[PDB]
Subunit: 214 residues, 8 copies
C-alpha cells in the first residue's frame, strides 16, 4: 500500500555501490515495516538491469529507459521521481549521498513538499509521541546523524510529510543480497508519461558582436 | 496578463542591493514587453516594505509576512513562489545569484518544470526561429553569459517553458528608481494559503546511548 | 594501580593506524613504567573489536558500544573518557593527533585538570628534580616536541597533575604487534552510566 | 547572585567586534534575567580597556593583565576563565565563535562540566518543563541553531548544568552601546594566582 | 610605424590597476624607444572609457565595444588582439599577469609566432649582439625575471620575432599619470570585422 | 590525406592514461572518418615508446626525443605540434584535459587559427548544414559539452577551421587496445628543426 | 664593543615600517644594555638614507650602496651581514619578520653559528641561571613568543652563541623617533670588501634540442 | 684533490632512496670527471652504515655518529657540511631535494658562498665559454631544469664558485650499485671538531604571569 523506495544510481551501465548498500538497508527496514521494497532506475539500455537489483530483495523494480536519461540531468530524473511518487505514494525514499543525490534529493523533496535528511549515519524504525497534540506516531523512519556541530548523534522524524526521504554516504551501510534468485516484478514504463521535455536552446546572437552605436 | 516577477531578498529588514538592481532591470525589460513589473518579498514585520521597492517601478508587490519566513528556509519560500506562480503564470522571474538564489532557484524551477540560467551576465528581449518545426518565438528572455569554458558569450532561450527564470550576481546591473512617488498596488497575502508546514522533529533517542546487547 | 591508557580511534569499523602506533609506543612505555597498557574504544557494533587491539599488548580493553557513539561526537566521547578516567585514575593517556584527537584531547584534559601537549615527536620516561618543592619526581612522561617551528626542541613534564596527556601525529611511532595471542581482559561497559551526566536537551521551535 | 559573563577577545589592544556584539546581546539577556552583565578580558597593557567595554552596559569587568596573556595561549586563558567561573558561578557564559573561541570554549566548558553549543543563530530566555520529573525549569538560555546544514533548526537547553555556554559568529548579533557614561566596577585581578594552577614545566635536556 | 601596445583589462567598467601600471611603464619604454604608446580595450558600454586610459600617456586607444565582449571570453578577445596586431605590427605588447592575462597571453603570442615571457620583474630597453647572425640588434625589450625560484635572475630577448610580448604582476610597476589633459586618438573599431574569423558554431542536441 | 592526431602526454616514461583513452576514442572516430590515426609524443629516452602507443591502433607515431623535451615546457612542445600540424594538416587533434593540456591546447590551437573546445563529454561525427550559405558540411567533429555548470548541453562544431581541436578529462573515455600486434609506422623526427623556430634568447647581464 | 644591530629592510628607497619599529625597540634595549644602537642598510641610491634612520637614535649606520644590492637577493645580503658581524661582533641583531627576514635570518644565523627566534612577540633583557653548573648569565635577550602549539608564552635565550637574533612581525612594536637632531656616525662601506660575486650563468644548450 | 660529494639523508638508520639515486648519478659524473666519489652521512648508531653506501661506488665515506645528529636539525648538519667542505674543497655536492635538502642546501651554500640549483631534472658535465673575456671553463656541472615559468629547459652553471651544488627530487635518477664488493675508505670523524653546540634554553618567566 505504502512502500519503501530506493533510487538506484547508474554509472556506465552499472548500479552504484551506495545504491546496493541502500537496497540492503531498505530490505531490513521494509521487513520491519511489513511493506514492499521498490526500486527506481533511470538510464539508457537497461535490458538486463533487474539482474543487478532483484537479488537484494526488491519486490518491484521501476525501469525508465530512454536515450536522454543518461547521463543524469536534473529535470528528467526529478520529474520521473516526482510523478511516480505522486501515484505510488511511498512512505519512504532513500538515495545515495552522491553528487546526483545532492542534486536530485532537494528538487524531489521540494516538489513533493516533503522532508529530507542528508548524510544519515543510521536508519531505524521508531515512534514519536507528540505530547502537544497528544498523539503517537508509529513506525516513522528515524533519520540518525551527528548534529549541532557534532556534539551528539540526534534523530530526525517527519511525523506527517511523505515521503520521508534520506540520503546516506557510500560505505556507511553494508550490502548483502537475499538470494541470487530473488523474484521481483519488473515494470518498464513509458518515459513519455513521466518525463519532462527540455525546452532550452543555446544561441550565439550576431548583434552581440556588432560594434555598439553612438 | 503574463508579467515579469522579481524575487526581493530580505536581510535584516532591508531589501538586498542585487534585488534592487533586478527591479531596475526588470523595469526595462517590462517596458520592452509592455507588461507589468511585479515583485515578491517574504519575511517578518514588513509594514513599510513598499517604500524600498515601489520607487523602482513596481506595479504590483506581493507581501508574505509571517513569523517563520525569516530567516530564509527552503520549503516556505519555495512553496510561496511555486504557488503564487501557479496562479499568476509569470512569463519571467528574476532573482539574485546569492546563497538564497542558489538554493531557491533550482527548487522553484524544478517544481514548475521550468528553465533556469544562473549567473546571467546580460538580459535582453529577443526572438528565436525554430527552423525544424518552422516557427518563430517572439519576445523571449535572452539569458546571456560566458559559456563553453569561457570561450564565447552565448545566449540561452526557453521557447516554451514558463516562467523563464534567471539569476544575476550583485553588481552586474545598475540600480535606478523611476520616481520616489511611483504608484503600485501592494498585496498582503494570507501566508497560510501559500506556505507549506514544517513537519520535522529533532530527537535524541535514549536507546542510542544504551550499551549494545549480546 | 595507575596505568597507561590509549584512546583507540575508529573509522568504518577500523581502528586507525595512529591509534595502533600509540598502542605500540604505549606498550614500550608501560613496560618501562612497570604498569599495564589499557585502551578505550567507543563506537557501534564492536563485537569483535578486541581482535584489532589486543595483539598490540593491551592488558585491559574498555569497550563502549552504542548506536550514538558512531560517528564520533564531542559530548558522548568526552563524558566517557572523563568518567572512566576519574574511576581508573590513569597516570598517562595517549591519543592520536587527528581531527578527532584535536577535538577530544583538549576537552578531556581540561575536565581532568591536566595540560595536554599536542604533536609530540618523542615520548620517554624520565625524572624531574624540582628545587622549589624540594622533591625529585620519578618516572614522568617526557613529552618532547619543537617549541615552535622545528629546530628548537624542548621537554614538557607535568610533575603532579594526572593523567599526563599527550598526542602524536600518524607515522611518528612505529606500530608492531606483541603476539597474535596476546591476552587482556575485555570489559563491555554500560554506556548510559558514562554519558547521562551530560546536560544537553533538544526542544521544538 | 548568578550573573551572565562574556569573554571579550582582544587583538592588538582592540576588543574584537564579536565580543562587542555579545556584550550587547548579553545586556538584553541580563535585563530579561534581572541579573548583572559581567565581562572578562585578558592580555597585556590594559590600562584603559574599560573604555571599550563598559559603555555596552557591563556592570563588572574583570581584568587580567600580564606579559604572558598576549597573544592568546590556551593554558593561561583557560585557567583564568575556569578559576574565575568557579568563584563567580555564572549562570551563562557567551563567547565569540572565532579561532580563539573554538579553542577556548571547549576547554573551559569541559573543566566546568558544561555542554558548549557552538555557532548559535539566536539566543533567548525561556522555560523548559521536564514532564517526567515534574519540574519546570525557568529562565533558561535557549541556544538556537541548525541541527546541521541549514533548514532544520532546534533549541538546545541545559536545564541544570552551569554555566550554560554558547558561542556566536561575528555579525549574527548587532552591537550597540547603552551609554558612553555607563558606570560599572573594574576589578584588576592578581594574575599569577589564577594561572599558577596549571602544571606545565619545560625542561632543557 | 611600429609601436608599444598595452592590453587594458576591464572589470565592472573599471580598467584594472595592473593595466594602468603597465600604461605607465609602457609610456617610459615608448619614450626611450621614441615610439608611441597605444592601448586596447574590449568590453561593453565604453562611451567614456578613454577617460581612465588617456591620462597615462596613451597616443592611440583602440576601443572594441560589443555586448559579447564582456565579461572576458577567450575567443573574441584573442581574435581582436591577433587581427589588430597583424594590422598594426606592434614591436611590443604588454599585459597584466592576471587570470585574464594567463589565458589571453599564450593564445595571442602563439598566433603571432612570439614567445611570451610571464611575470617579469623588470623591463628595460637594450641591445643584443648575436655572433651567429653576425649582427647587433638594437633597442630590444629586456624581459627580466628569475629563472625559477627567486635568486637566479636572467634576461630574455626576442631579437627577431614580433611583437615582443611580456606580462607583469600587479604592484611591480608604479602607476602615475602624465597629465589629466593628455591627448590621444580614440578609435572605435567595427567589432564583427575583428571576431568573425573565429569558426565556432553551436548546434542543438 | 587528412588524419586524426592525438597528443600522447608523457610522465616518467609512461604515456598518461588520458592519452590512451584518447588513442582509443580517436581510433573509433578515425574508423568512422575512414582516415588514419596518428599520434605524437615528445620527451627523452623514448627507445621503445611505440610499445605503449601502437597497440591502440595508431597507424603512424611521430616521435620527438631530445634532452630538452622533458619535463614538458611550453615553447618546445608548442613549436613541435604547430610545425608538425602545419605539414600534416590534420583534420582533428585530440588532447587530454590536464595540466599540460590546459597550457598546450590554447597555444597550439591559436597558432593554427583553430578554436579549442575544452573538457568535452562526448565526441561524435556528424553533419552540419549551413542553410544561409547553402553548403552541407560533412563528417565534422561534434564537440559536445555543458554550456556551463551541468544541465545545459550543446554541440560545438568548426565547419571550416582545421584542425578541429578538443580536449577531454581523464576517465571520460574508456581505454582499450586493438591488438598487441597492431602494426604502424614510427617516425623519429629531427627535433632541432622543429624547435629552432622559436625566438627566445637568455642573456647574462 | 658589543652593540645591538638592526637590519633595515629597504623597498624603493624607503626603510620599512617594521625596521623603524625595531630601531625604536632596539633603542630601548640598547639603553638598558648601556651599549650603542647600530643599523645596517643595503641597496642602491642611498645618498641620504641616513635621514630616515638616524632620528630613531642610531649611533652608527653602516651603508652598503651598490648597483647589485637591490632588489634583495640572498647571497649579497648574507655575506654583508655575516662579514660585518664577524668584524663588529654584535651581541644582538634584530630583523623584521618579512619575506626577506625569513630568508636572510636563517642564512646569517647558520653561517655565524648563532641562534634565531622567529616571530618574537616581546623582547626584554634578563638573566639566566644555568643551575646545572651554577653559572649566572647576565643581560641576555629574552626572546618571547607563544610556544608548544599555542599553549604557553615561553622565553628563549642563547646564553653563549652570538649574536642573539630575533625577528618580529610588523605592527608588534611602536615606532618613535628620539629627535630629528640625533647624531650618528654614517659609514659608507666599500662593497667589494663585504659582498661576494654572482658567478652563475643561465644557458640554453643547443644539443638539448638535437635528436637522440 | 677536488672530488664529488653526496649528502646521504638518513631516516631511522636507513639511507634514503633519493640519496642512493644520487650516489649512482654521482658515480657516473665522478667517472666522467676522473675524480673520486665521496659521501657524507650524519646520525646516531651508524656502526654498519657503510654497508648500504659503499656498493654504489663510494670511494670515501665520512661518518658523523653522535647522539644529537638524529633527528635532523639545521645547525649541526650545516656546520658538519660547511666545515668538512672547507677542509676537503669539493668541486660538486649533490643532495636529495627533500624537506631536509630544502633546509640544508641554502644554509650550506650561503655559508660557502657557492651556488645551488634546486630541483634539477638532469645533470651533465660540460664546458662554458665566457665570451666576454674569452675564457673557457671546462667540465662544469650542468644544472639542468625547466625555467622561466615552464617555458624552456635551461642549464645553470657556476664557473667559479665551489662547490657546485644541486638538489634533485626522488625518482628522477635510477639507482644501481657497482658491486657488493666495492671498497671505500670509511672515516669516522670526531664530531666535536665539526659540529657546534646548542646553546639555547626554553624558559617560562614567572613575572610574565604576575599582575602589571
Ligand atoms: Na587530576
Ligand atoms: Na558545574
Ligand atoms: Na610575427
Ligand atoms: Na588552419
Amino acid at each position: 500500500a505504502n512502500n519503501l523506495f530506493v533510487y538506484c544510481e547508474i554509472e556506465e551501465g552499472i548500479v552504484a555501490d551506495v545504491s546496493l548498500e541502500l537496497l540492503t538497508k531498505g530490505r531490513s527496514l521494509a521487513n520491519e515495516l511489513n511493506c514492499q521494497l521498490e526500486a527506481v532506475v533511470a538510464g539508457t539500455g537497461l535490458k538486463e538491469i533487474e539482474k543487478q537489483i532483484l537479488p537484494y530483495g526488491v519486490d518491484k523494480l521501476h525501469v525508465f529507459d530512454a536515450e536522454g536519461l543518461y547521463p543524469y540531468t536534473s529535470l528528467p530524473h526529478t520529474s520521473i521521481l516526482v510523478n511516480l511518487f505522486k501515484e505510488e505514494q511511498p512512505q519512504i525514499c532513500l538515495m545515495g549521498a552522491t553528487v546526483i543525490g545532492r542534486d536530485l534529493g532537494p528538487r524531489v523533496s521540494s516538489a513533493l513538499t516533503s522532508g529530507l535528511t542528508a548524510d544519515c549515519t543510521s536508519l531505524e524504525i521508531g515512534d514519536h509521541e507528540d505530547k502537544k497534540e497528544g498523539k503517537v506516531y508509529k513506525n516513522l523512519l528515524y533519520q540518525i546523524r551527528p548534529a549541532f556541530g557534532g556534539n551528539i548523534v540526534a534523530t530526525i522524524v517527519n511525523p506527517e510529510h511523505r515521503p520521508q526521504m534520506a540520503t546516506v554516504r557510500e560505505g556507511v551501510m553494508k550490502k548483502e543480497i537475499v538470494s541470487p534468485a530473488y523474484q521481483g516484478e519488473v515494470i518498464r514504463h513509458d518515459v513519455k508519461k513521466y518525463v519532462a521535455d527540455t525546452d532550452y536552446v543555446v544561441k550565439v546572437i550576431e548583434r552581440h558582436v556588432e560594434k555598439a552605436k553612438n
